[PDB]
Amino acid sequence: ATFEIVNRCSYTVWAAASKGDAALDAGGRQLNSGESWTINVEPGTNGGKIWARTDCYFDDSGSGICKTGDCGGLLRCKRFGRPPTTLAEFSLNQYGKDYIDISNIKGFNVPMNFSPTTRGCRGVRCAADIVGQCPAKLKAPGGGCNDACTVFQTSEYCCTTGKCGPTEYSRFFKRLCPDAFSYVLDKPTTVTCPGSSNYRVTFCPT
Numbered sequence: 199a200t201f202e203i204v205n206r207c208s209y210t211v212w213a214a215a216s217k218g219d220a221a222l223d224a225g226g227r228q229l230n231s232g233e234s235w236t237i238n239v240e241p242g243t244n245g246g247k248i249w250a251r252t253d254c255y256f257d258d259s260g261s262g263i264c265k266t267g268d269c270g271g272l273l274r275c276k277r278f279g280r281p282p283t284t285l286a287e288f289s290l291n292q293y294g295k296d297y298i299d300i301s302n303i304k305g306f307n308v309p310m311n312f313s314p315t316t317r318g319c320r321g322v323r324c325a326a327d328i329v330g331q332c333p334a335k336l337k338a339p340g341g342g343c344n345d346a347c348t349v350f351q352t353s354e355y356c357c358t359t360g361k362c363g364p365t366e367y368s369r370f371f372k373r374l375c376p377d378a379f380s381y382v383l384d385k386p387t388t389v390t391c392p393g394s395s396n397y398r399v400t401f402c403p404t
Contacts, residue, residue: 199239199290200396202315203248205229207308207402212251212264214275215239222246225274229401241394244289248399249279250308252341265340266307281305282342284324286312286399296391300324301379302371307342311403319391324375325404333370345371357382 203213210230215222215237223237239246251267260273267283269275282305288298299322300312306328313321332343346367347356354362362383364372372380377387 199241199243199296199394200236200315201239201248202234202236202398203229204234204398204400205231205250205402206400207231207250209252211308211401212254212256212267212273213248213401214251214267214269214279215246215248216269216275216278217243217246218278219276221274221276222248225276226251226269226272227274239288239290241291244292246288246290247278248286248288249283250310250401251279251283252307266338266342281348282307282338282344284308284310286310288397291393294393296393296395297388298322298391298397299379299386299388300375300377302328302375303345303347303379303382305336305338305342305344305348306371306375308401309403311398311400313398313400314391315396315398316392319389319395322377322387322389323403324378325402326374328371328374331370331374333367336367336370355381 214226251264254264256262256273267279269279284306285301309325311323336344368381
């Protein structure tokens with residue numbers, strides 16, 4: 199599958215794409231305002247994520263730090279990033295279907311739109327000013343708005359027992375972005391697309 203990743207933000211981001219134990223395509227790249235990066239993702243990839251990282255500083259060896267989404271100090275991510283991170287999530291060619299979602303379960307840093315570039319399903323977006331509205335206890339000094347699992351580490355927020363309800367924090371994320379996952383057991387906002395679809399992930403779509 200092909201994913202075009204478009205930075206429509208007014209600032210530089212550092213895109214990332216991983217399936218948790220490996221990079222997708224190269225794994226990460228700088229995207230100044232307006233730049234688009236195309237990557238190829240193998241059919242059958244399950245549990246892939248794409249996200250934006252902010253305020254990074256990388257040396258000539260590709261090692262450094264970001265204030266949101268850092269993946270172990272690397273430019274080219276092999277692992278998932280450190281919250282807060284808005285997430286584009288996808289598993290491809292699963293019994294003839296692709297499944298995509300946006301998630302705020304690991305917090306929110308940048309607005310994103312996740313839309314197919316081929317026919318037969320709809321896209322999803324989370325573009326509200328979550329950082330500006332972020333409850334004081336969830337605000338990340340580095341930038342962004344953390345999830346309450348990250349902030350408090352309780353069974354209820356982290357849904358560790360597999361039974362957990364919505365919370366006042368989850369409802370915040372849900373009120374601003376109803377079409378993204380707000381907690382581990384939220385009613386699914388997953389979109390089912392035809393197998394082998396292609397997609398565009400845009401940062402700061404509006």
